[PDB]
Amino acid sequence: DMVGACKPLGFFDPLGFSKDASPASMAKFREAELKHGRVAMLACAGMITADKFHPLYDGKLSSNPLLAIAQVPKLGLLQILLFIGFMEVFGILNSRRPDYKPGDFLGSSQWDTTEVWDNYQLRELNNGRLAMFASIGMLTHAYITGKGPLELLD
Amino acid sequence: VETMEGAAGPETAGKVFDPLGLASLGGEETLAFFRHAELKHGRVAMAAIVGFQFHINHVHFPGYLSPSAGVTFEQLAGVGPFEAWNLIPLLGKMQILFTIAGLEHASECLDPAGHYTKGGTPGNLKFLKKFWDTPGFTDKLTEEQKATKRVSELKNGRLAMIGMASIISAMSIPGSVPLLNGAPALTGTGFVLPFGDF
Amino acid sequence: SEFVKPFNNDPFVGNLSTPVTTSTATKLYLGNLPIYRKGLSPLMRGLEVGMAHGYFLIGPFYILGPLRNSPNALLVGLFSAYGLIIILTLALTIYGLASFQDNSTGSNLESSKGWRSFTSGFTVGALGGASVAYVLLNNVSFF
Amino acid sequence: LQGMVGNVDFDPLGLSTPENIKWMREAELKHGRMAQLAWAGYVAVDLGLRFPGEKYAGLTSLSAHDATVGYELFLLLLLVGTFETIGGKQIYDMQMSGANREAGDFGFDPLMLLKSPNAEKYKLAELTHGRAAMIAFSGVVT
Amino acid sequence: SFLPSILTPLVTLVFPGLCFALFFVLIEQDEIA
Amino acid sequence: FEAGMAQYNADYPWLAKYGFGPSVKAERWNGRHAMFGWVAILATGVAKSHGLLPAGDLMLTYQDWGGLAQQGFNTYISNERAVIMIAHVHALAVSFAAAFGPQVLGDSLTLLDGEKDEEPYPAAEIANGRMAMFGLISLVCTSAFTGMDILQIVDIGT
Ligand code: CLA
Ligand code: CLA
Ligand code: CLA
Ligand code: CLA
Ligand SMILES: CC(=O)O[C@H]1CC(C)(C)C(=C=C/C(C)=C/C=C/C(C)=C/C=C/C=C(C)/C=C/C=C(\C)C(=O)C[C@@]23O[C@]2(C)C[C@@H](O)CC3(C)C)[C@](C)(O)C1
Ligand SMILES: CC(=O)O[C@H]1CC(C)(C)C(=C=C/C(C)=C/C=C/C(C)=C/C=C/C=C(C)/C=C/C=C(\C)C(=O)C[C@@]23O[C@]2(C)C[C@@H](O)CC3(C)C)[C@](C)(O)C1
Ligand SMILES: CC1=C(C#C/C(C)=C/C=C/C(C)=C/C=C/C=C(C)/C=C/C=C(C)/C=C/[C@@]23O[C@]2(C)C[C@@H](O)CC3(C)C)C(C)(C)C[C@H](O)C1
Ligand SMILES: CC1=C(/C=C/C(C)=C/C=C/C(C)=C/C=C/C=C(C)/C=C/C=C(C)/C=C/C2=C(C)CCCC2(C)C)C(C)(C)CCC1
């Protein structure tokens, strides 16, 4: 079926969803899951590194994640949005392709993959889940205390 | 405009009531678009009537709207209905506008049958599942009750547009509406700009 | 779990079907670039390539030119971009003359008429892109 | 050249030829539409319909351009340039390449008003209103 | 005089560039049928 | 003279096909440029009369245009020379766009390529071009021999 099932929880699906949903709906769910995990991993790494190492912008932007983005200039935000939009139109074209594999920009249906490929895909998925929880935790902590992750840990 | 629901009414002498004949500007597509626009206007006017009543009466959520900027529902509830929108922080107004934007985009896109002008029913939004009737209160009824209930939706929507246009002018054209002139509550600007000043 | 296989199931062609060469991202980006996009006429291909290159060609001359610390820095940069574009389209024309000597097909980049249309589009697009970049850099205070 | 929207034999000092008639009609329709918008803008700005703002309150249609060149007219220039780039894609491909399309038809018919029983009426109305506005603007701007 | 400005670029950039272009095209001309 | 054309063609068989050479297309295009140039020198004459062209003994500086300013050389470039050169650069850029760009509209330059021919000679513009180019060569002849300049000759003759 898919790769997400793991030892600690098994096939975690209390509330249905998987059944009574179209294959297109399942592909959309897995694409959204992988996108969330990847973006959350990027956010976690960015917050962790930018807490204690932010050389850009003359080192003046705050370590608070929720205020550093406010202090970033408008042109930088526009360029980041343009880059993300370009990545997303590539994702849309990949969706329109007839051999789409939710989340697989690499292809990977055209190579002799084995169980190690599924294991590594599960590694990506579980790290993405952990980052999904962690990034929202980081943002909530920044809103509450005003400190970033590592500053809070101090 | 003869198959549409609002065609027959006791007050309109059972007539389609198109004096300017605007139904003939195009095919069935433009009339479907006009009906969808009418339904959306009536719905937003209904919500506007409820919010305006809740504002001119003392009914507000308790707490701080924007703890960072010190803007509070109490401050919004004592500057008249419309200057409250100006008093909302810009980024909060942008998060309301963006959510309405995404909802509108979903309405235009996600209909399985197709566009309301090209196969969908005008005013149908339930392809966004549980967007409407989240409680699901309407599940009990059948189609025949829903027909009369949609007729009442159209009529009440027209009346709500009339009411909100009343309150929006009485602000702007002094004493626009007799009996809506005292303004014990109707104060300030009548039509706000989006994002305050832009 | 092999990830590098023969190119088009041909072990004896001098290529490999690596993730870089053959992945869906590479295929999408390359096939959707103007030079490979489907349905675009040679004029449209040349036009898109022209504006894309002429927009960025001004910047090096403007910032790092001899007259960077001069009031006419941007004008000199635009003239330098125009000269480089003139050289580029001269190169394109002589390349077409040398390669597509005899041809009567047209509507194809590998034909004389198609390459001439592509070069014309490139010239117009590059001049327009350099001019637009000049306007943007003059009105940089907007951003 | 003998059959077109609002077509008569009004061609003194003639220039229109089977090759350039489509380009010329596109130019006519574009100039006409820009003229209707220019006439509406000038008459509104003169009458008193004005944006909310101190920067706009003291401006008039003659002096508005110089004051608004920095930000507002520059944003308008950006938007117009984008739309005109798409239109220029279509026109360059049509004239200097291959294409089956009419003049002035950019596909801006989402309301499907052209499905009406009277769509030649709309095309003609666009043409004459553009011309009448293009001459009224010639009067008022000069 | 102004002859240096008029002639040095003309004879050292435009003329040699055209000469290189002409020579390249001529050497790439194929046999006649 | 057709014999001389055949002698040329024969000698230079390549330049011949694109219209570069003693060709009617080449004669027409120059003639157009020569008529525009008569108009141009008249425009500069009236502009200099009405002191239109930033002008005088003002000269460029190395700090504004660098080595192209030629400051320190014997040549003394003027701001009028600079602005007229800018105008000519704009003319050249528009011309280059019209030539190497699409034959958007009007007339080609390279004999329309496509193996077209040269139409041997309103269609009186070639006669006007003969007039304009003979006038121009006469003007250089007097400017070289009599040494009486160009704008001065135009003004006194007109
Ligand atoms: C072979 C001799 C020779 C050489 C090496 C040079 C060198 C030079 N001349 Mg030239 N010049 C020459 C003869 C020569 N000249 C002659 C006889 C005349 C006619 C009166 C001129 C008139 C002249 C002027 C008016 C100017 C120069 C200038 C210059 C300088 C810049 C180059 C330029 O574009 O000028 C080339 C300009 C010409 C008019 C050239 C005319 C044709 C010559 C004679 C061709 C020589 C070809 C050679 C014998 C064979 C080439 C073989 C091949 C394999 C390379 C440079 C120092 C400029 C200067 O002073 O800059 C500071 C400048 O303004 N020259
Ligand atoms: C929003 C991100 C997201 C999405 C789209 C999915 C999607 C999927 N997961 Mg899930 N998953 C996620 C996050 C997500 N997961 C996280 C963070 C974890 C760690 C606990 C897991 C753990 C997990 C396991 C262990 C397994 C799956 C599996 C699946 C698949 C089947 C279940 C399904 O249809 O869920 C649909 C999900 C949604 C529609 C998302 C919204 C759900 C509700 C409406 C709201 C959010 C819940 C709750 C309020 C959380 C926020 C509160 C607080 C923490 C802030 C599907 C591809 C199974 C699989 O792949 O089997 C082959 C599987 O074995 N997931
Ligand atoms: C290779 C080393 C090098 C470098 C870095 C430079 C750099 C420079 N020289 Mg040059 N110079 C060099 C060698 C070099 N020079 C040599 C060998 C000589 C002796 C002949 C000179 C002689 C010389 C002179 C006489 C002058 C310069 C000047 C300059 C400046 C501007 C030149 C210009 O307009 O470039 C234009 C460059 C471009 C239009 C394009 C450059 C390449 C682009 C940026 C590459 C991008 C690649 C991209 C990442 C690919 C992937 C993209 C994809 C992912 C989408 C600049 C500081 C001028 C100046 O004012 O100096 C301060 C000047 O007057 N140089
Ligand atoms: C990294 C690769 C790459 C790059 C560099 C580009 C670059 C470009 N693409 Mg894109 N494109 C790409 C990948 C890429 N694309 C991919 C992968 C796809 C697949 C989705 C596309 C699909 C695509 C399409 C379908 C189109 C483009 C187009 C464009 C161009 C946008 C021009 C425009 O309208 O700007 C916006 C306009 C402006 C910034 C101008 C603003 C106005 C200025 C300020 C005023 C100038 C005034 C001046 C004085 C002139 C006066 C004129 C008159 C009054 C006389 C640009 C050159 C468009 C195009 O036109 O291409 C031919 C287009 O239609 N691309
Ligand atoms: C198909 C479809 O339609 O799908 C969707 C699309 C659509 C429409 C979008 C939908 C939605 C709604 C969504 C998902 C909306 C999400 C909104 C989101 C995510 C909104 C974040 C706000 C965060 C803010 C304002 C942070 C402030 C932060 C502040 C004020 C700070 O700077 C904090 C701080 O100052 C303190 C307090 C103390 C200081 O010492 C330190 C600093 C300065 C740092 C729907 C309805 O679900 C449907
Ligand atoms: C002399 C004179 O009169 O001068 C003035 C004074 C005066 C009269 C004040 C004026 C005014 C204003 C007017 C006329 C204003 C009228 C406003 C109007 C008519 C406002 C309707 C809102 C309806 C809503 C919000 C409905 C929501 C409904 C909902 C969400 C539901 O009940 C859901 C539902 O699931 C339930 C719960 C039960 C189900 O069984 C049915 C459904 C599924 C639907 C004028 C015109 O200016 C004239
Ligand atoms: C004697 C003889 C023969 C002969 C002959 C004869 C009589 C030949 C005569 C030839 C003749 C009389 C040839 C003139 C050309 C003039 C031209 C091209 C000028 C263009 C000039 C132009 C286009 C200038 C333009 C501008 O500069 C202007 C003016 C203003 C500036 O703002 C810039 C611009 C660019 C706009 C045979 C028959 C051949 C056989 C054998 O050989 C023997
Ligand atoms: C992919 C990718 C990348 C890259 C990128 C790039 C490569 C970019 C580029 C960009 C660019 C480079 C852009 C450009 C743009 C342009 C424009 C925007 C233009 C415009 C133009 C116009 C508009 C024109 C006009 C005209 C004409 C056409 C002609 C005549 C004149 C005129 C002016 C009218 C990176 C590395 C990041 C990484 C990730 C991925």
From TrEMBL, chain C:
Transmembrane domains' residue ranges: 49-67, 74-98, 118-137
Coiled coil: none
Annotated family: Belongs to the PsaL family.
Presence of the UniProt keyword NAD in the record: no
Entry membrane topology: Multi-pass membrane protein
Taxonomy, superkingdom: Eukaryota
GO biological process: photosynthesis
Major place of residence: membrane
Domain Photosystem I PsaL reaction centre subunit XI: 4-141
Any Pfam family hit: PsaL
Annotated protein name in UniProt: Photosystem I reaction center subunit XI
Keyword annotations of the record: Chloroplast, Membrane, Photosynthesis, Photosystem I, Plastid, Thylakoid, Transmembrane, Transmembrane helix
HAMAP family: PSI_PsaL
GO CC terms of this entry: chloroplast thylakoid membrane; photosystem I reaction center
Cell compartment(s), UniProt: Membrane; Plastid, Chloroplast thylakoid membrane
Automatic annotation (TrEMBL), chain E:
CC annotations in GO: chloroplast thylakoid membrane; photosystem I
Transmembrane segments: 3-27
Alphabetized InterPro entries for the sequence: PSI_PsaI, PSI_PsaI_sf
Keyword rRNA processing annotated: no
Entry's localization field: Plastid thylakoid membrane; Plastid, Chloroplast thylakoid membrane
A biological process from GO: photosynthesis
Membrane topology, record value: Single-pass membrane protein
Location, primary (coarse class): plastid
Keywords tagged on the record: Chloroplast, Membrane, Photosynthesis, Photosystem I, Plastid, Thylakoid, Transmembrane, Transmembrane helix
Family: Belongs to the PsaI family.
Function noted in UniProt: May help in the organization of the PsaL subunit.
Entry protein name: Photosystem I reaction center subunit VIII
Gene label: psaI
